[PDB]
């Protein structure tokens, strides 16, 4: 209960049965998608840091799509997820990045590309951290499919 | 209403103090079997290339089915896959293309 952790998710429900990319800011709160915040707060999709320390930050971001051949389209897709942090400095700082390309075969009908990445970084008080993607319109936000988290690792 | 065995019924869901039943928002979340959930389960909205076959109520989740001409197999439940049109040579077709199966060609 006196613990520093957080795992916020894609709103939009659940399945069947100077900074590159664009920031994801449609993440939201209280255990229903099964999110939570705990000694951290939110600020337009940026987690804000109370306790200065080492934090294992992570996010998965799912890319789902179908595709066609068109008159003026190159089909190559660069799916990159960025995890930046805003510090006391004017311009954001990229912390981690993970990328993938789509298949090339003109025979592709669809694309399923989920991207997990994470790692510990030392953050200070009031450091703000956010996820950021390319091909945003391709990101599926079913709530298990894409999320964003961090914890303190004392 | 009030609890019944420490359970709230479908459509409803329990409170923090554990004492009262609260009711899932309509076409937003749900609960179908008797529960002790502090939160209603969120509603599905048909991913693309599907059809909504029934709306998400309060005691039933929305139902999605593959588009017409696409199927959904057990091990590929993530994209609806296009039904084949032809069979190969020396092979003859018995069993049309359904929402859950490809076409079925024999010899």
């Amino acid at each position, epitope marked *: 209960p006196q613990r520093v952790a957080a795992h916020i998710t894609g709103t939009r429900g659940r399945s069947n049965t100077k900074a590159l990319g664009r920031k994801i800011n449609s993440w939201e709160s209280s255990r229903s998608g099964h999110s939570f915040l705990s000694n951290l707060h939110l600020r337009n999709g940026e987690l804000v840091i109370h306790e200065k320390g080492f934090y294992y930050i992570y996010s998965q971001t799912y890319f789902r799509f179908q595709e066609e051949i068109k008159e003026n389209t190159k089909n190559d897709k660069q799916m990159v997820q960025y995890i930046y942090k805003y510090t006391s400095y004017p311009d954001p700082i990229l912390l981690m990045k993970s990328a993938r390309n789509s298949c090339w075969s003109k025979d592709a009908e669809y694309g399923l590309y989920s991207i997990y990445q994470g790692g510990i970084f030392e953050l200070k008080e009031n450091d703000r951290i956010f996820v950021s993607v390319t091909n945003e319109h391709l990101i599926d936000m079913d709530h298990e499919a894409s999320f964003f988290g961090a914890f303190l690792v004392g | 209403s009030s609890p019944s065995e420490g359970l709230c019924p479908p459509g409803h869901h329990i409170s923090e103090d554990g004492r009262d039943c609260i009711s899932c928002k309509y076409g937003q979340d749900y609960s179908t079997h008797w529960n002790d959930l502090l939160f209603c389960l969120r509603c599905t909205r048909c991913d*693309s290339g599907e059809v909504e076959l029934s709306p998400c109520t309060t005691t039933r989740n929305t139902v999605c089915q593959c588009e017409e001409g696409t199927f959904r197999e057990e091990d590929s439940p993530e994209m609806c896959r296009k039904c084949r049109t032809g069979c190969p040579r020396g092979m003859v077709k018995v069993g049309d293309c359904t929402p859950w199966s490809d076409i079925e060609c024999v010899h």
Partner: antibody
Framework: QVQLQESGPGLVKPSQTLSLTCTVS??????????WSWIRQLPGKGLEWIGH???????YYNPSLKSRVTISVDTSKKQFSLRLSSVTAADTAVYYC??????????????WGQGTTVTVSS | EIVLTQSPGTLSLSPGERATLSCRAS???????LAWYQQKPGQAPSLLIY???SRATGIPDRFSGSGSGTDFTLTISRLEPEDFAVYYC?????????FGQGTKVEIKR
């Protein structure tokens, strides 16, 4: 058959709260079906979906309208009401109320009111 | 937000000639979640096509809907002079429910 009446002030004052109400004739809101809904249309261009409400009193709003918006029902009173907040120039527009068949099999608005044109000034 | 993009802005066509209206969504969306509206000057809109390709009650067969994924098409076959309003698509895909800028069919006399 089923008809809708845009009742409500055609004027509201800069950063005061706009309000309107919709009336229902022939058949009643109650009936666990449709979503009673507010659409505005912004000086001769795009329609904007504001938010809708169900007969169980549960709402749905357009995020970007960073809750200024509230909307409600009274089946005993046969009307649903919208209220913006804090309004300005960018809130001046015709405001339709309408009945969307949530999935009671369509998805889409089969019934509209004629919609009142609201102007925000003092 | 999912963005619909109606092409083109306007169309001029004499009666009898054939009208193809495009509506293309920034992300692919069901199909159950695409509907078409017609809005005659000084009227509230009214529902033409629902479910990408279903005629609302009362709508003349002259009107048709097609498409899926991101590309959706509304087709008016043999134009009457009435049919010269403005036409909107909207998507109940996800959410805000959104509308396209709209395509305006103008008569040719």
């Amino acid at each position: 058959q089923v008809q809708l009446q845009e009742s409500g002030p055609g004027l509201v004052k800069p950063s005061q709260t706009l309000s309107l109400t919709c009336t229902v004739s022939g058949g009643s809101i109650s009936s666990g079906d449709y979503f009673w809904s507010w659409i505005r249309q912004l000086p001769g261009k795009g329609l904007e979906w504001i938010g809708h409400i169900h007969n169980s009193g549960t709402t749905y709003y357009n995020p970007s309208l960073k809750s200024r918006v509230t909307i409600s029902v009274d089946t005993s009173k046969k009307q649903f009401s919208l209220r913006l907040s804090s309004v300005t120039a960018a809130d001046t527009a015709v405001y339709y109320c309408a009945r969307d068949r949530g999935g009671d099999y369509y998805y889409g608005m089969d019934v509209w009111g004629q919609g009142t044109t609201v102007t925000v000034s003092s | 937000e999912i963005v619909l993009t109606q092409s083109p802005g306007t169309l001029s066509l004499s009666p009898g000639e054939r009208a193809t209206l495009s509506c293309r969504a920034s992300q692919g969306i069901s199909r159950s979640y695409l509907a078409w509206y017609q809005q005659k000057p000084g009227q509230a809109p009214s529902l033409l096509i629902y479910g990408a390709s279903s005629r609302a009650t009362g709508i003349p067969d002259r009107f048709s809907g097609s498409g899926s994924g991101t590309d959706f098409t509304l087709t008016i076959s043999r134009l009457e002079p009435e049919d010269f309003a403005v036409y909107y698509c909207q998507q109940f895909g996800s959410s805000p429910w959104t509308f396209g800028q709209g395509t305006k069919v103008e008569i040719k006399r």
